[model samples]
Target chain A: RSNVVGLIVSDIENVFFAEVASGVESEARHKGYSVLLANTAEDIVREREAVGQFFERRVDGLILAPSEGEHDYLRTELPKTFPIVAVNRELRIPGCGAVLSENVRGARTAVEYLIARGHTRIGAIVGSAGLMTSRERLKGFRAAMSAAGLPVRQEWIAANGRDGAIKVLTGDRPTALLTSSHRITEGAMQALNVLGLRYGPDVEIVSFDNLPWMAFLDPPLPVVEQPTRRIGQEAMRMLIHMIEGTGNATEMRLQTRFVTH
Target chain B: RSNVVGLIVSDIENVFFAEVASGVESEARHKGYSVLLANTAEDIVREREAVGQFFERRVDGLILAPSEGEHDYLRTELPKTFPIVAVNRELRIPGCGAVLSENVRGARTAVEYLIARGHTRIGAIVGSAGLMTSRERLKGFRAAMSAAGLPVRQEWIAANGRDGAIKVLTGDRPTALLTSSHRITEGAMQALNVLGLRYGPDVEIVSFDNLPWMAFLDPPLPVVEQPTRRIGQEAMRMLIHMIEGTGNATEMRLQTRFVTH
Candidate 1:
């Protein structure tokens, strides 16, 4: 009871992170804990400091969505001592609990949806290839295509998250695109709009995560609904268990589903 | 220099406290000092923390934007041995330099333009009331209206910023609006768009800060272009000056002008 503390998260603007932080803070405070707010701006050094500061403050628990990086030091170091629940992907670190959606499974499901609708060619605007989230999603896409005995070629998978759209649709255009993130999906749509491409005709697209206003866009989007709220709730519960020295060395995976508007 | 470093900021992403933290880190790195970034979020807490953190960090110098608050602490507590620059606002703190825009002149020029172009019942959307920046702009509007012997009533001043447009432009309508921040102007424009209001006809508008895609909007916007880059550069220079023990006692204010699109 000596520690009146909760967590540190990066990027409150990202709907997923925002929902997670809100869930953690509300739950932590309800269970008698003070929350310290830190925005990493998705910067690793800043995120590390914020995490360090929270632990330094002797917060009873830790709920962290570590900045997108290859291997996380916090994931490796913390679980040996205290309880920690990581939201999203962290490749199997020792003695830790994590809550992640079935990205690969979810992604493959999304691509399969496009295929089932009688579309053969598929292209994807993948997320940052460096992060596990993007990697798993790509894996899902590959599995789906392989199941259908479809070709997984270079032109279909857009490597970079920031800018790789023109190549996806310019030459040998796919029937549809799998957009990486919500904002990136918006950018892609803007590009499509500018190119005089109509959705459901020129390209039938399915995006990774949907946001508040995506349904209202011209030619409403089909989306993969990641259960962000549940992830946040479960992750916070797990983090509290860690802080209280009551959590087991378990890895929990959540599932995502497809929704077409 | 054995002490103090200044932080200059323009990265206006709301969640990135790193801008302020960067300043503190830059100063701390300069001479075994520990500093914290101070951000206003264009709110009241801007100056309070900037000066307080500087004193707490025991930095030989400090730099920040002065929002709506008493900054006498910066003047009294900060010793002659230390230098402080209140970026974007004029302050009376001794040995403290400031980087502020000539708001009065800018506001007058903006108002005159509106008046000269057949706008009598003009509306103004200033920044946060009582803030150092807003006060001067408010004064400029008053002066301009008074010079023409027109009553610049309370109703003429929109609630505060762009958020107030709905309230200001209702049954009691103003032919033209002079707004503050670019973000607020965008918000107002959205509101106008929602209400099916057309600019340059239903209401002509002029804004303080120049938004990047002003020309792309339904009707191009005119703006009082504040020296954003210059302000940032000046803040950085003053911080550097303070770090090297060459500090200005008098608060330094910069200049701004109008740009018609």
Candidate 2:
């Protein structure tokens, strides 16, 4: 019953990953498994490298945020029982499992909330390219805007959240904005501050993730709070179940809540 | 030159460790090594358990923020070449190295700053018991207060930062407070908000561990910023050296900076 699970995330600097790390570690330990965490900084090669290292290190299973879609090497039959449960991102590998959130619906709902607040000119700061969450979030943002008969422009959507906010806010600035992730929201805040535009009055925006410290901000900020810790916890729990041969590989998508502060 | 290093911390939810995790991972990868991370949640048994798991998993070395003192078991002779480097704490073992901050001086300077700001009634929320950093930080706080001939009471010093702040602030309020750790400061912030006390005037505070998001807070916050990233980097470097036989085990203490908002 003794086992070690490898947990790999794209970046450890973000508080979002910290929560995930806590959840993974707590759930892994509680389920009689130890976890080994690795950060790839969103590099596909490093993700592959970490997988290889964890493989050679003899972990029973793994939980990771896959950088891209194709992962045929993970299907290697040499180590037939080396199971993996994806977190944050989904993997379609036959014997693998995944735990992610309802990103599209969450993003669409956040934008709809902003539209209800009487803001017609809205822009979005999305996540990195090649990520399903990023693409899905953008799709949701467009879906909401199109339903309201509002035109979405190319310059209004950016890959890098903070830099995108800075550039997008400088011209034809949207009265409202949507940040696809927690990191993007932080960048948007910084850019908003530098532009001397207050988030409440000068601008209105909704974010992807919500953290405790956000409550301390004067008027606070509203967000589409993803079940981040649950995502990590479920991933680890799934990995352990697969390792014990007590559970089948599956895809699990949790929901998000629109929180108003 | 192939190696896998284990990195352990008490908690991963704190942004401070997130930075340290980033530092350790970045340095380890750059130095031709892979890293594994574990969180103990400040549990002594879990710390011991994690060490055992990492050892059994065949890591070349370890970098840990020890939860307590007296770790002779880590000196186990079974693994003759396994190197251990302590971070955020010091271990006076013959074959070990440690990377820590000048916690005493940092605490004393922060207290002195508060005393200079017309605050005679100063209180402190120390860290968890049994940690040398906790004892040393408290010693520094006492040293500053004693030198100023200010009366210090036992109730003003609690083992838990937030709970300590809440109970202490409720009775005979202190003009200023010092939080020994980032988690403590967060708790203190929550408590203050609940008490309807503003930090700048109603209740001034100087905290440990500065974060980027803290700068966004209204009126922001003042903190003694430790070289968190550097601590993790140096620990990794030291562990690598000890593993490669290129360096001798020693203690390294970095300084802190007092930043004002």
Candidate 3:
């Protein structure tokens, strides 16, 4: 009777994770399993509680998107070795597998797209510094700029990154802008709009995570779209294999598609 | 120890419910409770399973955005009178309360806005006929057109509402379009884009459900913005009251906002 898969996501409000949840539910249903979804909203305490709740229900496996900071409970405190497949975000729990998008490769493609457009001075707006996603994308940004022999100045990298786009847009303005995630892209677009810059002409943007409405914009935006649904499906499939004793712990890095404007 | 609130949403990928989920998590956290979110994707069997899982977890309360068809399980199969609050969509269970946006009023406002823009033969793309949201929105569409002494033709109403948008845009060629819910809006927008219809000048559009990126659309979109976050917060508060034995079963109808492009 324990044919349930426990899915713990960081935020359901994010369309990215919502799509992931949909994929998980779709694959779980096809595999004759139901999912018990928990929303952590990026709170560590709530994440633990959700994991515990799944345990209490005796679910067959878990699909987790871990929050920032320590996950010692998941790594060491759980009873014996439980089957879990992490998605979107990676966790360092032994005996667990992960299915993640190629964040570094995707971001590098984004910056390289800008570089190919003859835009040498490109600015970037990354997510919070605490997230590994942010670090990977930033690393990609630097690598691409370095490969292109472009200048990477301190003023170009904004700290307390929420208002980073506006800061980069104002002083020592870059010819193009690249954003890490959905929220950052929205912020960058809003800042660009406020500054009275025409999107494609005045300031070109190559953002991460292609949302549904992005295609319909006046000048359609270029985005590095992650394989969100595939991530969820692969994670669930991996978890099922582990539950059936046919899987071993391994990381599966999926490729991303870079859609040009 | 079991203070978790089980929140069952119809479609998390729909940004409307995502915002609602965010609000519920925020309020539940403030009230010293966490949430277990279940995405049904409008599947009735999955919805029932989600509810049953919460019962197995012994959660204190529930906040649900119900799927279509009968929810007789909530009234008949439960062990006792559980505290459950329905949001967005209403369920006919005897003891459950509901917090809903004024769907009828919102749709009326959207149609009226189109009328004010001097568009007579305005077409509407509503959701499925079985849903209350669809019915109410269609009702508003009729009411507004009637009040303005405009022809409310049956052909103008899309039949197989799922892909009704493309037909309405192409064959009939209404001067304006109004879509219900995010899915319908997206479908209509996609159809419009495919047909190469100039958004603002050629065929004006007003859609329901104000998503995060609506304001950034080409000419921006006029929308009937439901109080999604407030719906979640109010539903959580109502459920908390019932759990504390300080609330009565009641339907709270909240207001909606109509934004002009």
Candidate 4:
């Protein structure tokens, strides 16, 4: 019998998830297994359908990056102890393995770095409020700002886009900005550039996800680099253990690195 | 009876393909059809397996971004009249619809732009030679160089990576560089930064694919932007027509826009 693992990613376009998928593919190939990879595009409906298709295919196990929505179906529909491991983003389903980065600490570290640079007014642009990653990053941002005795401007915590960055920069703008994800960082940078703001001197910026090109920028930006590869390898290991009845359900949270120039 | 379409991408990690997949998903949903997306990771074996799994699921139609190799199985294994649409990358199977950007023209236009900026020694870093997109882009590069009476250096046409960029930049250093895809552009940028070359002043660069952050860079890079969303929509439309026996098998080549600072 062949062992096939169904690997579903919430967003295949994001380099972060793509790197994680590469890790999963490499590790699975080494372990004598084939992977059935799926792209959900971060839609709850699409994720649900992908899950159903994976089940219908009779995959030996599953590794999923669920979208930003309810996951009651995973808990209620599937067997209580089925071999399922959630990677990147956590799915709060019982008896499931999870491997995720420390989003809260990562975001806090980034914001605290800005505060330590003597920037009293630090703004944050994060992903959708619906996602746990987003909420945790915001929580971290809030914690750092509160500890620094600074106000958490509600306008700065908007969704990942240029509009939020525009609002943060236009009226009562912060001297520094903290973007919670790659998508938001892209948008925030767009807004800053359009407003003719220099990165380091005018408005210091720190972004999440240290993509390869980030290091090549004119004034190479600082970023919080997640341990995406380890997440993939660990998620697969956990899922394989469950499939072989060798391990119990557990959550693995990996650390992130803060890189600056 | 349920209508399902299988959509497979060459590289799920590239944001360009991700955006295309998003377009397919939204349009398919509007047409009361569901999409089963697979990430092939530019591997022929993985793509073949994905096709088999989709067939096993009894999907009504298929959309694929084929890898850089022969597509004999597509013609031999499946029914010749099956509804199949190839997007981003072309697959020359009979009775299949193809939607692709005008790669040759796009690259030619980019090279021409660099030439217009008074740069003679222009170098290009492209994707793998096995891909039609790569070949077409190189063709365009050669055409532009020949038109301007400049030599197309053999060493300049290296495979997509930092190593390739390093070779071209360090050897017979070109005043300007043209990168074929987002991946190649990233590697090239890394090499340029590591070599301490200023993008606009030291060595002008024009890249394919206008990523969101491209507009935000300090010097702001120029790029050839493809109509990725339209490609996705048109591919789906063609596939649906073929499924319903309303359209003939034909190729659609979309235009690209050159955006600059």
Candidate 5:
């Protein structure tokens, strides 16, 4: 019956994550809880420190967009009775519940789109390679390629970043590309533009993490639409249910879709 | 016996708002409540949609950084039982509480810093004339300048946006400048570069929001620091009070301080 909720996330700039947080915030407020927000910038050390500070401050519940790291600490910090929901990025740390929008399914759908469009030697620019989301997308890519009997070109699998994307685009570029993160998509776009290549027509593109400008880009980019806002809403429901003693250690996974033009 | 309380607010892009949200999220998470996050994107329609969605989603409680204009909709849309606290900005609507931030005082501190640096005829690139925060800051500027017996020029008080700040710097050419929002401040800095006027050394300047490159600039720009983290904590606390049927419509004003170079 105490009065505060705490929210922890990795980054604040990504519209996807921000939208999720917004949904949760809106719901939480209506439910009569105030939220404290913190960013770890995806660093585990900083995340631990920030979580430590939240405990000292005495907030009521926890909603987190966990960073990419070991899940050991989450088990220590969050008690089984605590209502905590992890959105977007989550791990099965004991005693914590998680709600993730479909990642592998979204990735498979996205890659299949490119495959249907007659692109065999497809390339992928995934999110942080070692992260769960990235790994899931990569797995989906493999699955899609295998199902379609298309070779999964190792060289086409680009690690995302300005330099990494540039290396792929400047080298023997892929016929089509799929990106799972917004920043990666932007970096790839910039890289392609720098290499004097065109988007959509000249080089078919499919990406994830739809930004406001995604559809507004010159070619009206194709994307795998993650249910970012829905993730926030659903995450709130699970978190609140736990806080109110009506929740369990359930991990809810929602679905995403591929939209191409 | 709820484990965590959830809080949400509008717009996280604004560094000041982000800081407050971060504070609330960090602290609340530590205290065991999951924080919900949200942004209204400065649009009433979108804000309403977000609020409605959040309410149905269900969070233990709530925190808000409300949209501009009358908040009558919140009366119907916001759940009466949930704890709610408004931060940074305020709405004098019923059935809600707020923790205010000292923007006017901070504005005064920034302007005073410009004046103390042997500069007169200080100019301001304020935000849109109507926004509550911008209006308050302008009010602070007038009082600060009036107390110092310095006259404020009309052309100097352009609203938010970079283009307006540029016009003031290039056309009006106030010896020193006080900018309202960070976006406006960025434009002023760009204009300074274009006009070849260096900060502090050539043309003195102090601003409200902190930008990352403030220190890395040619001469480095100084800014007034907002107690964002504290504001988050306070807002969450107030919302908790409100959620348990103890919430009241009290305008809580937090403080901002100067970052002198």
Candidate 6:
């Protein structure tokens, strides 16, 4: 009869993920449930082992920001239809739940906004194409370009985080940029600062995050702000509901806010 | 054998603690240990429960940023000789280890530096006197002011974080200010921006933290930067040492770097 749930993440240091964890904690505590947090550090082996430990502890249910690749390790050990809800991406396991952001639209809206402003040449620093979050975001970027009848430059659509931005901005960079994640944006900002390219004047940008510090930049940048905390809260709520058998697991794709100054 | 340690913190959303967690995770992973994180949100009940659960699940040891109040419940449930390391403050538990910042000296040095620059009127937005970190910092600030023959203005030494800074700067304020923590500095910065008081020109300010984002501010700030990540690594290191019986638990008061722009 332990009032506990396990919440696992890829990186605890990333402020975006940290905020999501906070949201999960808020709801878990409110519902009289304690949360045990685990960090995978983006390693699949670490992620799999953490799941095993949480299972051994007999937590009521689980919430996780899934790691990349097939979680085949989970299939054999844990029962099918176990109470697990993934945040920021989909859980491949059937009968489990997921709380995802409208990543594709969020990416498209930012790129579209820049396109309307006559920014023909644009670059993006998305995450790995293997991951769903980044893959979907790039798909949206490609869609936006196609819709505008503009050619999608392969070189500028680098999938690496900060390094990709650095490479793209090194030579002939785009007039504006679109970053698919906050961590990538942090790296891109450093790259931009080093290159002495002002974001607003030299390269207009719209990244995916609502971190307040982004406002402190000399030339403030707009963002496709995801409901980060809400993602966590909803995951906890859905997981707890599944645990208590009060409701079935649901796939919830929350809408994003296009934030502008 | 389960290779896991439970790392508990007050506020995970605060970048300072998040970085510390990152340190703990990096070291834990390096030593083939996984870390389970818990957020106290500054609640004693929550902190006590986390300790209980981590213990029940048989984590090798524990590391925590001690909550504001006494951990009286821990005394009854867990053995005093249990391998628990306290980061950022001391644990009342005997035979346990602690990793602390040089709070008093760091604060004194910042105040002394400002004093040398002909700043007679100085203020500080320290946390509550109940907490050790803020108390030691204020002790240093008082020592520096006494050494320089300057009056310690009680009104400006408001212990309330952002609200205190607002009240101190509402009508009349000091020529310079010192903040004890990164969160408090964030609050003070917002207050300064809202009041339109230029940090360098109107009121010189020093705060505790070496967060990279601080560099992005309009007038870059000088800081008494604590070895934040090292605090986590040292805590994990000390706790693991205690768990393995390889080394005795130490009272580590790490030196802080006084960073200037």
Which residue window of length 10 is worst by lDDT in model 1 chain B?
A: B8-17
* Model 3: lDDT of residue B142: 89
Best by DockQ: 2
- Candidate 6 chain B — worst ten consecutive residues by lDDT sum? B211-220
Interface Cα RMSD for all candidates?
7.3, 2.0, 2.8, 3.8, 6.8, 2.6
RMSD of 5: 10.3
lDDT of 6 by residue, B1-261 (tens): 456788888888877788888889778868877666678888888888778878887888989887788876666778766788888878767777899999999999999989998898899888877888988999999999999888876887888276888888774578888899877887786677778776677887888987666664546678899888899889999988888878888799999989876
Error of 4 at A222 (Å): 2.3
Q: Against the true structure, what is each candidate's TM-score?
A: 0.58, 0.85, 0.84, 0.81, 0.59, 0.83
Docking class of 6: acceptable
Candidates ranked, most accurate by TM-score first: 2, 3, 6, 4, 5, 1
Per-residue lDDT of A78-133 in model 6, one digit per residue for the tens? 98757889898786877779999998898999999999989988888888778888
lDDT of 1 by residue, A1-261 (tens): 543444555555455665565456446544644444455657888767766665665556666676776435776545457566678766456666788888888888888988898878888887667777878878888888889998866787785243566667775688888876675675566556556676667887787776534443345577888887678678767767766766664677887878776
**lDDT over C-alpha atoms for residue B222 of model 5:** 79
TM-score of the A chain in candidate 5? 0.93
Residue A141 displacement (Å), model 4: 3.3
lDDT tens digits, residue span A1-261, model 5: 655677777886455666777777668757866566677878888777767766666666778898888878767766656666788777777667788868888888888888888887688877678887888888888899899988765878876365666776666567788887877877777676667677766676788866434553445577888887778878888878877777675788888877764
Per-candidate DockQ vs. reference: 0.07, 0.57, 0.46, 0.31, 0.15, 0.43
- DockQ, cand. 4: 0.31
Give the runs in model 5 whose Cα sits over 4 Å from its true position: B1-9, B12-66, B70-261
What overall lDDT goes with each candidate model? Answer: 0.64, 0.82, 0.81, 0.81, 0.71, 0.82
> Order of all candidates by DockQ, from best down to worst?
2, 3, 6, 4, 5, 1
Query: What's the true lDDT of residue A190 in model 1?
Result: 54
* lDDT agreement of model 1 with the native: 0.64
Query: Clashing residue pairs, candidate 6?
Result: none
In model 2, what lDDT does residue B183 have?
75
Residues A1-261 of candidate 3 have per-residue lDDT tens digits of 567788888987788888888788778867777676667878899889878878877888899998876887887667656888888778877788999889889988989988998998887888777777888888899999999999887677653244787788888688887788888878887877778777777788788888766777766778999888888888988998888888776799999999975
Better by lDDT, candidate 5 or 4: 4
Candidate 2, which segments miss by more than 4 Å at Cα? A1-5, A26-34, A56-61, A68-83, A91-96, A115-120, A145-156, A240-248, B30-34, B68-83, B91-96, B115-118, B144-156, B244-247
